[PDB]
Amino acid sequence: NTKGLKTGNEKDLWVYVEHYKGEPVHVVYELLGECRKLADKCNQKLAAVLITDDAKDVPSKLIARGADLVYVCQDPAFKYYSTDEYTNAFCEMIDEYQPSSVFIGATNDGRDLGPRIAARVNTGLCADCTILDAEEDGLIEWTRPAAGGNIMATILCKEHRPQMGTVRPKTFKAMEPDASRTGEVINYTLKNHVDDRVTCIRREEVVSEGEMAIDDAPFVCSGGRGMKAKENFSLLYDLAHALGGAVGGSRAAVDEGFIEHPRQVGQSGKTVTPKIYFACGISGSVQHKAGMSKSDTIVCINKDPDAPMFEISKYGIVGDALKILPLLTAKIKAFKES
Amino acid sequence: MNIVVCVKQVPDTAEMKIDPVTNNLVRDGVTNIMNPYDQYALETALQLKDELGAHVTVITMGPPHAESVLRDCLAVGADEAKLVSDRAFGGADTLATSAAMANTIKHFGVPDLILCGRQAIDGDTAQVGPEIAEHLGLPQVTAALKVQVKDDTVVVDRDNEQMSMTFTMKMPCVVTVMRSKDLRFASIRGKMKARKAEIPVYTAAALEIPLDIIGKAGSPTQVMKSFTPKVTQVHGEIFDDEDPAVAVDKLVNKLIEDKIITK
Ligand SMILES: Cc1cc2nc3c(=O)[nH]c(=O)nc-3n(C[C@H](O)[C@H](O)[C@H](O)COP(=O)(O)OP(=O)(O)OC[C@H]3O[C@@H](n4cnc5c(N)ncnc54)[C@H](O)[C@@H]3O)c2cc1C
Ligand SMILES: Cc1cc2nc3c(=O)[nH]c(=O)nc-3n(C[C@H](O)[C@H](O)[C@H](O)COP(=O)(O)OP(=O)(O)OC[C@H]3O[C@@H](n4cnc5c(N)ncnc54)[C@H](O)[C@@H]3O)c2cc1C
Ligand SMILES: [Cl-]
């Protein structure tokens, strides 16, 4: 029928501020860089939407990274992401201010959030997009991979507002912070509080005291079923330490007990774009490759010269990772010294 | 307890390959399957049936030939199957698909737990389960790694990029599933009992779902164009010397010369 239909008076492009330890995650800044170009193309403003327990100096950083406007909705209930709290706050602000488009980083939580909002407002949502463009009138052209990346689709939300999408992280470049930019902070008071129906009973940091997470590591040293045993992962830790990188693995590695889920790379785990990905005893299933095929360089170490992973590896060695790794790590260490 | 599993028949997109030489899409071994994340959702429902005695209904919105997926569900021990099939539902985006599914579920009475896959491997949107949950006013947890029931609560393990978490919610609720053990085997007997089952087929008119909320008519989004992306062929330097020390020397001197490894 008519819910979510455009009024014609909608304006501005909004970027959702996903935050951790109070600070925006980097995909926020990625989207502010891209959406700055889109907002300039259609002569509309770029807004950052900050739902938090404590804004700190974050609106200032958002302005320096391209935002003209920063909407802030602050409450203690917003300390941690929750579907019920954030969907409510985000939808009250859409209703109040009437944006043209909304852009959400396709993180685990963004992928939870986006479709809740879209269904609540009754509007269109394009998922985990990789290419974006805009017409002078503000109509956003959403392009995205589908079918495991085998098909690209270009999609429009012509009549419903706001036009929504989630956007793949690590795709778009942020702008360098500009101290000379100016913007406007708008403090939004919640009209209706909600009770969160979803209680968190365990919330544990996956990365330890000062250690490296695969998520942001410049090098990833990853092991599969071909590592043979959990203890042999110490080889990958040694290589990571020599490089200043982090250790990852395949879903098969998780299943065999070699590593815990937070180090899993692939479509059901993390997608990483390190400078080097060392794929050690990993066949290169399509589900794994989904998570690491945009690594700058892939180095494959595998006993099977027909391992699919070789298909996409600029460099590699056919052989036993258990003999090759410690020679490789030593040789790299020697080069890096003195 | 009553459980509904939302299942989707998909082409097996894991079998698709773009040849980097020709930039053409090769479809060798691509058949219609049960969406793998839906096999995880179903196996999770089945595990709860084994443990607690739950009644399990599987529902899909698909063309006639999607019936085979429902049969596969019954063959592994789902109790009931429903096929929502009508050209009026075709052309649906995720809003239109979730509207159809949410209205179907409501018509038969909202169960204690609705399980979805995390995503379907064709569309790859991961939107339908949360949109269903919103349409039905229910709480959600997406991308479950484990699901358990304790009294009147569902206990769900879910991660994000920084945190490993466990959440609880009261029934009725919606969970989308990232992983479970592989769906159990369907025996010959299982498949025969499934073949003999009645699977009702529901039109939009039968369910009194308005035409303007479903299919293309109910879709805010429209795919305007699709194309095979270009894939740049990689011409790897792969060393296969007998002596791993030799292979490693060659590899490292190349990584050095090509500015991959620095001091
Ligand atoms: C819906 C779905 C989602 C999935 N999600 C993911 C995901 O997110 N990430 C994921 O990784 N997978 C995922 N998978 C799984 C995927 O299909 C594969 O099962 C998995 O990636 C294989 O892991 P592997 O390469 O470690 O093991 P295998 O395929 O068993 O390969 C082991 C390799 O080790 C090699 N080898 C053996 N011994 C040695 C040695 N001594 N030295 C060197 N090499 C050796 C072999 O030659 C082989 O190539 C998913 C699958 C489904 C169906
Ligand atoms: C190339 C391409 C790109 C597309 N891009 C978009 C887009 O960005 N936005 C959009 O709104 N639509 C898109 N669509 C339409 C979309 O695929 C359909 O609306 C589809 O019915 C549901 O979305 P999905 O396949 O992403 O499934 P998902 O949202 O990933 O499915 C999640 C879960 O919902 C349940 N579910 C999904 N479909 C059904 C079904 N038919 N019956 C039962 N349960 C189901 C299953 O449990 C499933 O695992 C696209 C289609 C194509 C071919
Ligand atoms: Cl709700």
TrEMBL record, chain A:
UniProt cofactor note: Binds 1 FAD per dimer.
Binding annotation for FAD 2: R225, S250, R251, Q264, V265, S268, G269, S283, S285, H288, N302, D320, A321
Electron transfer flavoprotein alpha/beta-subunit N-terminal domain boundaries: 13-201
Binding residue positions for FAD 1: L125, A127, R144
Keyword Flavoprotein carried by entry: yes
Family of this protein: Belongs to the ETF alpha-subunit/FixB family.
Protein name: Electron transfer flavoprotein alpha subunit
Organism the protein comes from: Acidaminococcus fermentans (strain ATCC 25085 / DSM 20731 / CCUG 9996 / CIP 106432 / VR4)
TrEMBL record, chain B:
Listed GO MF terms: electron transfer activity; nucleotide binding
Protein name in UniProt: Electron transfer flavoprotein small subunit
Domain Electron transfer flavoprotein alpha/beta-subunit N-terminal: 22-211
Record keywords, A-Z: FAD, Flavoprotein, Nucleotide-binding
Organism (species): Acidaminococcus fermentans (strain ATCC 25085 / DSM 20731 / CCUG 9996 / CIP 106432 / VR4)
Top-rank taxon, per record: Bacteria
Binding-site list for NAD(+): M61, D86, G91
Stored Pfam families: ETF
InterPro entries in alphabetical order: ETF_a/b_N, ETF_b, ETF_beta_N, Rossmann-like_a/b/a_fold
Residue positions binding FAD: 6, 8, 35, 38, 61, 92-94, 97, 117, 120, 125-128
